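Supplementary material to the annual report.
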Amino acid sequence: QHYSIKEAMLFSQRIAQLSKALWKSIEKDWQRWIKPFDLNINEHHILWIAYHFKGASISEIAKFGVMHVSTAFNFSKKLEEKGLLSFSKKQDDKRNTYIELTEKGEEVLMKLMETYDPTKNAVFNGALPLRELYGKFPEILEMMCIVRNIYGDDFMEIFERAFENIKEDFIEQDGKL
Amino acid sequence: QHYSIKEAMLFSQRIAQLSKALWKSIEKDWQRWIKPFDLNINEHHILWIAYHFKGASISEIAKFGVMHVSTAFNFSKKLEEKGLLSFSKKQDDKRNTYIELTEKGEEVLMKLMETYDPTKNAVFNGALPLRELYGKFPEILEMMCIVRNIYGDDFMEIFERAFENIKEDFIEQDGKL
Amino acid sequence: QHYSIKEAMLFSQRIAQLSKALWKSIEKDWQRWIKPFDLNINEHHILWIAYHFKGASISEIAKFGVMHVSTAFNFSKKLEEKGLLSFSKKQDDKRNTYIELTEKGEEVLMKLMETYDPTKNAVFNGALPLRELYGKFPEILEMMCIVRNIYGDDFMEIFERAFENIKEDFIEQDGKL
Amino acid sequence: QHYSIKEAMLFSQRIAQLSKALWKSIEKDWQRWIKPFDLNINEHHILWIAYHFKGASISEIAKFGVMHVSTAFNFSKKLEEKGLLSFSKKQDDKRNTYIELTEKGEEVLMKLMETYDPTKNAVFNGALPLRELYGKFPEILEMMCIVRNIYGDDFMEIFERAFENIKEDFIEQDGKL
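Predicted assembly:
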């Protein structure tokens, strides 16, 4: 207890609607960006996970991709067909299968990056006011706090991984390494 | 411009991962709560929209339900089959079809409410630390600001609608009106 | 431990400068507003404390006025001279002396209120951007959290007291009850 | 307009009380830390400003010290008497007088640093809960936003100056360079 029941219902509905809105917008923009290259959302997500972690287990891919293991194997295979990634020999347990990007896939990823225009995506524009007032893009700490308690600190290490990987691996003259 | 390209990529990835995590958790908890009653997530969402707005157009239902019109008609029909809601006579345009809850549906909704246990749902527990430190549940303003610029102030009026409807229509001794 | 020493120094300096800036600005604006009526900052603060709490002990006045007891007695006396407030008979302990506003003082307070122009005060203008982005004036929760741990929940009840007193006791056509 | 008058009064009182509380606590802790060395708050503030800016004008000192010019000259002189700082030859305009720390003063500053214990100061402890929940000390952005609109971006550059100076100039084994 030490909270009202009402309060709980209000908060629940509030976040469920907010989170549905946000996921749906990001989903739509993202799908726009990547549909030229015939990639599902999951597939691009998987490709990035491989870039950032220097290859991964399916169980890694499903953890950081917030998908089920099944989907991670299925879409991983679909990508193998497209020559984007490679598979390890052991298929004992789908979970332990190890994935690693082919070179063609890495070029796909870099290309998609040069195709990137922020000003086309909704959520970016929705956040620009806040960037202007604060001088920096919104941190949305409360959200991160929540997802940490939900998903775990090792989960949460992907944010640090990707920050460092973007900063170090690439540089910009018009947008790419 | 007046921001870095890098910055944009960091922010994009950050929010896309955060928002996927949040939507997936709420999705899983919600599905747990409502699966006894053989209801899709969309279907429950539609039923609430009808309760709050005293019936609605399909186009209303899709706006506030963040779904496509097609889905809103399809799942609305599935609910009509279940005797939960009623349909208007005009089917000229799916969009203008007017939906209104049957009594059986309203009982379903109230029942689901008495079935509600917050302590079972992840995101609730993830937010309790913040509730303790602040003395109130997290407001997540930055998120709301964003969704407002994205979706519109009339969209955003559902939060006020539902706050007032919960407060006024119901009272709690163990949880329900 | 479980923090860096450096971190501690950074945070300390940061807040000490921020808090000096804020106090000095509010001090200057406030002094501008009240200098017509020949009132020190403390004296006006004391008068409000009496209005809100329906009279008070000196020890109350010093708690909520964040001043020393000595100052609270001295400036309280200066106000008695001005016919603004009245004193209880017991002077056994300065702390237990009970203060209550004269009518003249209450008129002074209401007058000062009609003299109030927000647009003249700095800190108000500094906060208007945030009010525009958020649709509401900044909550500055982190600050309140801090002051709560510092000063105590009974201290913190003055915010609720004054919110309710402003809302209920007064109404606005051009600014006053 | 486009806000209520009431709202303005609420916000004003709220921040004025919060800011008085915070300044008074920091004032008391700070005075505790520095009273061994017979230093006013202003005097220590002035000494730090000189360290960070490699000497300064009085007008600089008053800007960043949020004091009047008069006080900045007076307390600067008192420090010259103590052999802490040195003066430029020109006294044409007090404002343009240039101050620079003597070596004795720098040792005083470093000493005070080794005397530093965070766990003694109130505001530090008031913020530790937030540090624990967030994993980092509170940013209090809203406050900084406000002070920026109030005081100016060049004013605000002292935060960056001191961050970099602390990080680079010193290192810690038990607390000092």
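Chain C has two domains: 31-116, 118-172.
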